[PDB]
Design an enzyme around this catalytic site. Structure first.
Site, PDB file in Angstrom:
ATOM      1  CG  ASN A  93      76.516  45.099 112.832  1.00  0.00           C
ATOM      2  OD1 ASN A  93      77.572  45.328 112.218  1.00  0.00           O
ATOM      3  ND2 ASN A  93      75.968  45.951 113.701  1.00  0.00           N
ATOM      4  CG  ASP A  94      73.304  46.838 116.978  1.00  0.00           C
ATOM      5  OD1 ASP A  94      74.595  46.908 116.857  1.00  0.00           O
ATOM      6  OD2 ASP A  94      72.543  47.739 116.719  1.00  0.00           O
ATOM      7  CG  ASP A 126      77.831  35.866 116.459  1.00  0.00           C
ATOM      8  OD1 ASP A 126      78.352  36.425 115.406  1.00  0.00           O
ATOM      9  OD2 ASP A 126      77.074  36.438 117.201  1.00  0.00           O
ATOM     10  CD1 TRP A 180      76.110  40.125 110.390  1.00  0.00           C
ATOM     11  CD2 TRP A 180      75.235  39.185 112.233  1.00  0.00           C
ATOM     12  NE1 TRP A 180      77.095  40.081 111.346  1.00  0.00           N
ATOM     13  CE2 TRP A 180      76.588  39.499 112.480  1.00  0.00           C
ATOM     14  CE3 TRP A 180      74.529  38.639 113.309  1.00  0.00           C
ATOM     15  CZ2 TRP A 180      77.200  39.239 113.703  1.00  0.00           C
ATOM     16  CZ3 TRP A 180      75.135  38.406 114.477  1.00  0.00           C
ATOM     17  CH2 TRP A 180      76.463  38.633 114.684  1.00  0.00           C
TER      18      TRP A 180
END
Ligand SMILES: [Cu+2]
Ligand SMILES: [Cu+2]
Lengths: 121, 368, 103, 121, 368, 103
Positions: free
Chosen positions: D97-98, D70, D51
């Site tokens: 970003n969640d 990630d 992201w």
């Protein structure tokens, strides 16, 4: 207050660690995660195994044998965290508190809770 | 602390009684019961707290896994959890599943597996997973591979993957109809009935410039969706027959918006149906959307008027309210791991410490 | 399971006939002991520490009687049918163990 | 200090939450658990997913597109935790970003870490 | 904090360099490497921290479950874990397994399951689970059901459950021989070789009045087991050929004893092999056996004389040492979740924060 | 897997023959597009936000080619053998999606 000072039992809180019956708990108090002082929270499984401690009662001044049974089949409650060592003795058995006493349940070997029932004098 | 009533036991001892241990049972689903889930900062494992408002006592706890979605039937008949585990927990075979508990005993009454690890892992939001009005179904959102709505039937079984448009929340209007609304092409009506999937799109509310918060408020009982923006409220009334737009109202009083007042982080909104009140988390923000906010303004859903004040005294991240006659306002602090309970008419009553790690979601059943 | 019978669980009176695996010094007194079939031996906490009598669980049928516990004297009796040699133990301390021979 | 104050970039720390590149992280810094600013720690898996956030470099006064990937197949490290939101945008995608961007691995979908690689101007 | 050396980053950025992301690898087993296990207050899931002394850098991590026991191969060739998982973690079907990691890649090279959920669930102590001298077997303790030592062969498989007396730790003397030492009936030698298990009992050291801590230090390289009492030191030389007792030494200087000194809580003892020094956590205690200590006394193992002082400056629960020429004393506080690293000649050097939850064990390799 | 061929990965020059689709607004241009078996298809990042091209994985053989990534220009070409219709998508946003029909 001051971790290395002689245990000082009380008889008025129960959620606190200086509580008389808790003289040799390792874990957490059940009352803090929906159990009660001698009963397990719901969905949890009660062990048969336990470990003893001779705790002194400040009101009526006599010691009683507390049988610290675990409630299992859940993850640590993370609530009222306590570690007391009145007369604990090493792993060379039964007065011994690092052991997860969970023998009896569904198959519950997982530590959630520690109960503090009076079993005798 | 008053649970210092273990003066109850002193009493029993003197009376020469028992200490006959057994597994106890939760008091029984009611209006003041509040569920606190803990996504715990992205940890493989997690926890859900069941507390009694009024008492402020935890009645139980439930264990869950990675980024699970919490649900509670309004009738107070069951509470559930969509979840994910891995063998060698964090890695290895993944397993997604639906778990349904008896609200009294806390025992899993069902465990239903989801076919191809379809869950959609995200910091949770009420409404990205939901029960349908009859409580026979549980709808859940799939993101990866293809946008989809999974249909689980508590008759204990994965039903079908309902393919849907580029669309996110799920607000169930009826037994077979839901608003997987909020789209860039604003609001879709999904009818999963009989054999297929319908999929009808609404007349676009909101413009490209209006940012709809990730945490909307909705009343399944009475199809009221209230959706704040990074500033203010879009309301919609939906039945099995199309949604119907209401006129916009701004939570912040113009001068305030000038003076940097803006919406908090997390479960920012709440709506009491018995009344037509919207609670909303605000403070003086920036691009700091996900931050904690120290205040809450009360507004009339019908007449955009601020009936209420509300200075919380704490850095609060999420809120909700007791869906009853005289409601409690729930203020959840993620940083302090504590739930501050209040009178929906200002005062602070209770507090419930150590809901460990990063508690973030409040859910309650709306019950008569 | 099978082999053998139940009866009661903590209370504490003998009766006429003896028959009793017992307890103290943490260790079922006269531990290795023989007895005839069709029977019922009484175990009874004489201790200042509760206990139980749990066999294993491939011996005495399916399941595997646990047995409970509870100082205060407290008693648990178990009767038997088939022949062989049983091996039981106290759970909270798998150590004191006992072994019965049904002849 | 003061959580509701405009983010203020620095270019001297990196394990700090006010580092220029970290303008839209959700999670933990990799550098803090055996990774590096743009590399994953050992035994962990690199996602392809990510992201973006356009971040402002204090030294050279230019903004860069940071692709937050990630490091999966592990439980949260628990270390340098941060939550930044410069230009986040709601779940109606990609600036958001969640979401645990972890698509790529062994089958790694568990969040351990977020890297802060500059993928362009 | 000096990783403000992300000035190397700014640096690369200016030279117009790259940013080509990849999974990196650990530096490689060495003497300054330290492992920190997080039992986490008995949580269903746990974590291992791999750290570099000197650097004070976290080099990697490993994932584990319920009350796992870490082991580290002396020659620096492997690292391993005995673990426990549940389907629906905390409940469901239990699985006991041994996993084996590559010291550089951190990936699991083997994953061996234990048959009847045999592990022994306890707070961990270095020594209730042990690698033997050649590193081809892992020995583990069974308590429940029957006292037993399980034998797993890394050549990937569970081997045999070796029956034993009422006995505790496992201190291996050889490929086929271990001292399932400390029993009530003091000191057991089991030889698991060929077909069987022999089991021969030592000449009872210590009396029932003297209490041996749950955490003795032991040097596999040179059969040195040093076991402190709730006050002072018993030593035994272990070889193939039986154990041999050495004269007892008192860690506390007599006047200290009346003045209330006694050993601490957790991993209290450490022993440096190149020297013949004993490290011992102490303080003014009582029945507070498991609590933290502010001090450390160094002793000559041959000549029970005190060579050293040590005011740690923090409430430490566990210690150890780097098995090298000029050693570091590792000091672990479980409460503050930080590892304090000092020069085994006084001064604190480095510091390692956030080894979160409640960290407790240190393990190092005894490397050439 | 099978169907079809690999070639390169991020670099960016066409050649003679067209055959391409490129970025712009989270969407593959001329998305649903037909081609003959054996025609190359070059995807070219035209965006200020990287992308890939990953079909799924029951379509293209076993596995499932995931496409890598690329910013400002970079490219990925995929050549093809068998006929049918192939659906692909950009992972980081499973949304821009498209379909190829090899005729
Ligand atoms: Cu016993
Ligand atoms: Cu894309």
């Amino acid at each position: 207050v001051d971790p290395r000072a002689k245990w000082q039992p009380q008889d008025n809180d129960i959620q606190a660690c200086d509580y008389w019956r808790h003289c040799s708990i390792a874990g957490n108090i059940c009352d803090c995660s929906a159990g009660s002082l001698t009963s397990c929270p719901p969905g949890t499984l009660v062990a048969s195994g336990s470990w003893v401690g001779s705790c002194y009662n400040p009101p009526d001044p006599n010691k009683y044998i507390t049988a610290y049974r675990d409630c299992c089949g859940y993850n640590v409650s993370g609530r009222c965290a306590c570690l007391n060592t009145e007369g604990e003795l090493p792993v060379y058995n039964k007065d011994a508190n690092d052991i997860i006493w969970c023998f009896g349940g569904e198959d519950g070997m997982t530590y959630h809770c520690s109960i503090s029932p009076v079993s005798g004098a | 602390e008053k649970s210092k009533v273990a003066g109850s036991a002193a009493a029993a001892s003197a009376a020469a009684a028992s200490d006959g241990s057994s597994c106890d049972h939760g008091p029984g689903a009611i209006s003041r019961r509040s569920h606190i889930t803990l996504p715990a900062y992205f940890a493989g494992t997690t926890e859900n707290w069941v507390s009694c408002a009024g008492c402020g006592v935890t009645l139980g706890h439930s264990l869950g896994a990675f980024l699970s979605l919490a649900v509670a039937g309004h009738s107070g008949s069951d509470f559930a959890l969509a979840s994910t585990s891995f063998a060698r927990s964090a890695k290895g075979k993944r397993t997604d599943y639906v778990e349904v508990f008896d609200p009294v005993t806390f025992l899993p009454i069902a465990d239903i597996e989801l076919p191809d690890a379809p869950r959609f892992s995200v910091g949770p939001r009420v409404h990205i997973i939901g029960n349908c009005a009859s409580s026979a179904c549980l709808l859940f959102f799939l993101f990866g591979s293809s946008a989809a709505a999974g249909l689980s039937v508590p008759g204990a079984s994965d039903d079908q993957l309902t393919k849907s448009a580029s669309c996110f929340h799920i607000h169930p209007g009826a037994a077979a109809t839901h608003y997987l609304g909020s789209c860039p092409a604003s609001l879709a009506a999904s009818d999963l009935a009989a054999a297929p999937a319908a999929a009808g799109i609404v007349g676009a509310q909101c413009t490209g410039a209006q940012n709809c918060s990730s945490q909307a408020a909705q009343a399944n009982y009475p199809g009221m969706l209230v959706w704040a923006v990074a500033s203010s409220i879009l309301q919609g009334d939906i039945p099995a027959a199309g949604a119907t737009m209401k006129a916009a109202i701004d939570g912040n009083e113009s001068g305030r918006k000038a003076d940097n007042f803006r919406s908090a982080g997390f479960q920012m909104v709440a709506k009491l149906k018995n009344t037509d009140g919207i609670m909303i988390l605000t403070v003086e923000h920036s691009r700091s959307c996900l931050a904690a906010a120290e205040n809450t303004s009360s507004v009339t859903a019908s007449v955009g008027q601020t009936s209420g004040p509300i200075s919380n005294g704490h850095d609060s991240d999420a809120i909700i309210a007791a869906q009853d006659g005289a409601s409690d306002n729930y203020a959840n602090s993620a940083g302090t791991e504590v739930l501050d309970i209040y009178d929906a008419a200002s005062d602070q009553d209770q507090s419930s410490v150590e809901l460990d790690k990063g508690p973030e979601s409040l859910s309650v059943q709306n019950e008569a | 399971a099978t082999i053998p019978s139940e009866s009661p669980f903590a209370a504490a009176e003998v009766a006429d006939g003896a028959i009793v695996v017992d307890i103290a010094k943490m260790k079922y007194e006269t531990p290795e002991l023989h007895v005839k079939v069709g029977d019922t031996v009484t175990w009874i906490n004489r201790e200042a520490m509760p206990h139980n009598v749990h066999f294993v669980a491939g011996v005495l049928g399916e399941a595997a009687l646990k047995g409970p516990m509870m100082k205060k004297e407290q008693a648990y009796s178990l009767t038997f049918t088939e022949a062989g040699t049983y091996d039981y133990h106290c759970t909270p301390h798998p150590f004191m163990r006992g072994k019965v021979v049904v002849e």
